[PDB]
């Protein structure tokens, strides 16, 4: 093979089918691992009297001659792991008095001969894990008093009888984790003194075994993945030197109030699923904890003496309990992370977190905390993260928070106070409840601050309207709409003598668009009063009734105008076809009522108008009330399509002219100015297309109230009826 100078022959992977020859007799480590050897002939190793480590790890070995391993009295380590031995080679390994380690873990061993392991007076490491045996070889193991490590992990041992390991007085480590163990007798672990590691992880344990009481020197115990539910008090009486318990993923119900008593060297305790536990465990005598974790229980209190002891405590997880009050955390100078989420916490006292240096992460999420003291963080050390999400807060302290890096207040909707960026100098990731509160931080000064609710353009930091262009456009549109609609209404209602249906529709449409003019004027005046400081007024405007009033005004005006246009087209169709003033007035009243109901629908709903200071629901909001937006868009489309097809049929079947021209102008302009509003309303929900929020807001502002400032000018300067009625008014006033 590949002979080596250090007398360590490595024949791995050579593919030979026998014991290699032509090797120095003074070799001390022979490796025949990966090749294919199926049997060891008699006196196979007669040429290696000084062999010390034999590794047959990987051959398809299936038979060993009784005299094959004879004469290797200097052998110390033997490895036969991945072969296909069907049983422990009892007769093959006889006489190897100097053997100290045996690997048989991966064989397909199904039965251990009774007289096996005879003469192995120096054995100290045994591997039998991944075999398939049903019972612990009690009698074969009774002949190995010097054993110090045993593994029967992946076997199929159903249970362990009494006095199985009686003579293993020097055992140290026992691994039975992935075994299919279902029960353990009271005296199974008998005589296993100075045992420092026990693994029973994936067994099918029903209850907690009582054999542990016979392991006075246990240090690490693993029974985490069993089907254990009950851990009665006193389960660790006979283990004063215990240091580690693994009890995760086993569904527990009751763990007892005194399970972990006077455990001096325990350094961890993570209990999950203990639903029926409602009292804090008796931790007296356990003062070396590092991380304490009691997640799922019904605990409602914490002993005030918690920090008097356990000075080494670092992590405190008490989340899924129902904790109302909080004691004083004075002490616990090494306490690092605190989780108090999903409890029911009413108020934070001033001295709860007094001192307590090195406290970095403190979670207070999902707790109905309506009161936080003003100076509950002045005496706190370097605290990196701070989350108070979903806490129903009414105010927030400022002192001592400059060192914060990440602060989260996502769920505190009632927190309407304005935060100050003068304090959170080092703040990096802020999550305010309302997007207006993060204006002072210049969302996306001294550093870069990332705000979770994006400010964007739909939440104007300084100017609701935007640039001077949009400002003056909206200003003059509102002025024209209001003044001309008022003048048209005055001229129309000065007479109150002639009431043709077409002029009735004209007057009603003017009235409807007057409300849109009024709402645009409200927006302009709000922008004028709040110049550069609109983010301050944003929360007030959204949460106040002004948003509801504006949203109503706008929606009612739009729907009233649409319904009036539809009914005017219906009347024109009836006139073309061939007395009906009463039914037309009734239809107009019904349309007014329907528009009022449509405008009031968001008032019945919750938060539809709160999408933006525009307070128009569907343009700036697409996901909330998406069904309502779709229904209103479809209704508007149906009305426009019906009026369009009626007009088309009228012009087809027909060759008062001013009324026809005004109806045509009105329908064309209304369709032209109404399509982009719906398109931009549905724009954000379309993933494929991306439109800037500034453009969306400008388009909405310049398109929604356009008919209000357009139609009265048309009616005034596109009809001699205006001149005739003005002469009539002049005669009336003179």
């Amino acid at each position: 093979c590949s002979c080596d100078g250090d007398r360590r022959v490595d024949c791995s992977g050579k593919g030979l089918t026998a014991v290699p020859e032509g090797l120095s007799a003074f070799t001390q480590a022979l490796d025949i691992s990966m090749n294919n050897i199926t049997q060891l002939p008699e006196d196979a190793f007669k040429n290696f009297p000084f062999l010390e480590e034999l590794q047959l790890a990987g051959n398809d070995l299936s038979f060993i001659h009784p005299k094959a391993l004879s004469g290797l009295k200097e052998l110390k380590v033997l490895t036969l792991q991945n072969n296909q031995l069907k049983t422990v080679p009892s007769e093959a390994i006889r006489g190897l008095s100097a053997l100290q380690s045996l690997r048989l873990d991966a064989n397909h061993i199904t039965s251990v001969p009774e007289d096996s392991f005879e003469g192995l007076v120096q054995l100290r490491h045994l591997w039998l894990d991944d075999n398939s045996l049903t019972e612990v070889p009690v009698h074969p193991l009774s002949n190995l008093p010097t054993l110090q490590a045993l593994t029967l992990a992946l076997n199929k041992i159903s249970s362990i009888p009494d006095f199985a390991f009686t003579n293993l007085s020097s055992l140290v480590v026992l691994h039975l984790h992935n075994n299919k163990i279902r029960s353990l007798s009271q005296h199974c672990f008998d005589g296993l003194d100075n045992l420092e590691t026990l693994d029973l992880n994936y067994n099918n344990l029903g209850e907690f075994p009582q054999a542990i009481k016979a392991l006075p020197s246990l240090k690490e115990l693993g029974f985490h993945s069993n089907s254990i539910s009950v851990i009665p008090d006193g389960a660790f009486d006979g283990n004063p030197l215990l240091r580690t318990i693994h009890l995760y993923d086993n569904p527990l119900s009751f763990v007892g109030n005194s399970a972990f008593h006077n455990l001096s060297d325990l350094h961890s305790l993570v209990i999950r699923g203990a639903s029926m536990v409602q009292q804090f465990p008796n931790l007296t005598g356990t003062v070396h904890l590092e991380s304490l974790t009691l997640t799922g229980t019904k605990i409602s209190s914490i002993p005030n003496n918690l920090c008097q002891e356990q000075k080494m405590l670092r992590t405190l997880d008490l989340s899924y309990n129902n904790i109302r009050d909080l004691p004083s955390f004075n002490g616990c100078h090494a306490l690092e992370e605190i989780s108090l989420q999903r409890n029911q916490i009413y108020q934070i006292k001033e001295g709860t977190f007094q001192g307590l240096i090195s406290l970095r992460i403190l979670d207070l999420s999902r707790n109905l905390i309506h009161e936080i003291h003003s100076r509950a963080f002045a005496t706190l050390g370097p605290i990196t993260n701070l989350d108070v999400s979903f806490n129903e807060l009414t105010s927030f302290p400022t002192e001592g928070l400059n060192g914060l890096n990440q602060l989260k207040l996502v769920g505190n909707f009632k927190l309407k106070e304005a935060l100050a960026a003068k304090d959170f100098v080092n703040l990096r990731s802020l999550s305010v409840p309302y997007a207006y509160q993060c204006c002072a931080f210049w969302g996306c000064s001294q550093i870069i601050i990332h705000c979770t609710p994006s400010t964007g353009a739909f939440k104007p930091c300084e100017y609701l309207l935007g640039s001077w262009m949009i400002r003056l456009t909206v200003w003059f549109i509102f002025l024209v709409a209001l003044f001309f609609n008022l003048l048209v209404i005055l001229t129309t209602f000065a007479s109150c003598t002639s009431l043709p249906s077409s002029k009735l529709f004209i007057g009603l449409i003017s009235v409807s668009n007057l409300f849109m003019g009024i709402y645009t004027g409200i927006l302009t005046f709000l922008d004028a009063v709040s110049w550069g400081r609109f983010a301050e007024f944003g929360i007030w405007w959204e949460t106040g009734s002004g948003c509801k009033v504006a949203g109503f005004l706008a929606v009612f005006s739009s729907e009233s105008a649409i319904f009036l246009l539809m009914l005017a087209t219906v009347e024109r169709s009836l006139s073309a076809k061939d007395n009906h003033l009463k039914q037309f007035r009734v239809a107009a009243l019904l349309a007014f009522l329907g528009a009022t109901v449509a405008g009031c629908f968001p008032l019945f709903h919750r938060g539809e108008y709160s999408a933006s200071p525009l307070c128009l629901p569907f343009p700036t909001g697409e996901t909330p009330s998406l069904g309502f937006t779709v229904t209103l868009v479809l209704l508007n489309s149906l009305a426009f399509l019906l009026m369009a097809v009626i007009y088309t049929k009228l012009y087809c079947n027909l060759e008062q002219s001013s009324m026809i021209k005004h109806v045509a102008w009105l329908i064309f302009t209304n369709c032209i100015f109404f399509c982009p509003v719906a398109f931009f309303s549905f724009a954000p929900l379309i993933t494929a297309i991306s439109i800037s929020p500034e453009i969306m807001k400008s388009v909405t502002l310049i398109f929604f109230p356009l008919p209000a400032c357009l139609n009265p000018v048309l009616y005034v300067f596109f009809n001699p009826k205006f001149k005739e009625d003005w002469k009539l008014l002049k005669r009336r006033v003179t």
Epitope: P66, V88, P89, S90, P113, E114
Partner: nanobody, 108 residues
Framework: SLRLSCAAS????????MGWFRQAPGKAREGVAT???????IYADSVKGRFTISQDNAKNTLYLQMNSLKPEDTAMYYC???????????????????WGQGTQVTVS
């Protein structure tokens, strides 16, 4: 049909748990018949009925008679024995302390 004959030429006394094994090419050795010192016999599932065993301590000879040889019987046959006692008999190959040279048998 053949009668394999095995002789304990150098054995001193007390033949304890003799047996017969067959080996396939490049495979493990499987027991076909085990005879205890009390005359009790243990036969393989694919063997019982077809084969018979007989031990005579007067000549210390073990005879394994074979009949109705199916082509699955072609293998190298060995006889194995264990002088020192203290273990339970069976078809395991890890208990016998002495093995024969074995003859190749094929259907003929």
């Amino acid at each position: 049909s053949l009668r394999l004959s095995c002789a304990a030429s150098g054995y001193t006394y007390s033949p304890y748990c003799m047996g017969w094994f067959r080996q396939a090419p490049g495979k493990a050795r499987e027991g076909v018949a085990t005879v205890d010192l009390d005359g009790s016999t243990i036969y393989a599932d694919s063997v019982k009925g077809r084969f018979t065993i007989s031990q005579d301590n007067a000549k210390n000879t073990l005879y394994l008679q074979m009949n109705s040889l199916k082509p699955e019987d072609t293998a190298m046959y060995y006889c194995a024995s264990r002088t020192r006692a203290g273990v339970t008999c069976g078809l395991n190959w890890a208990i016998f302390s002495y093995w024969g040279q074995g003859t190749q048998v094929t259907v003929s």
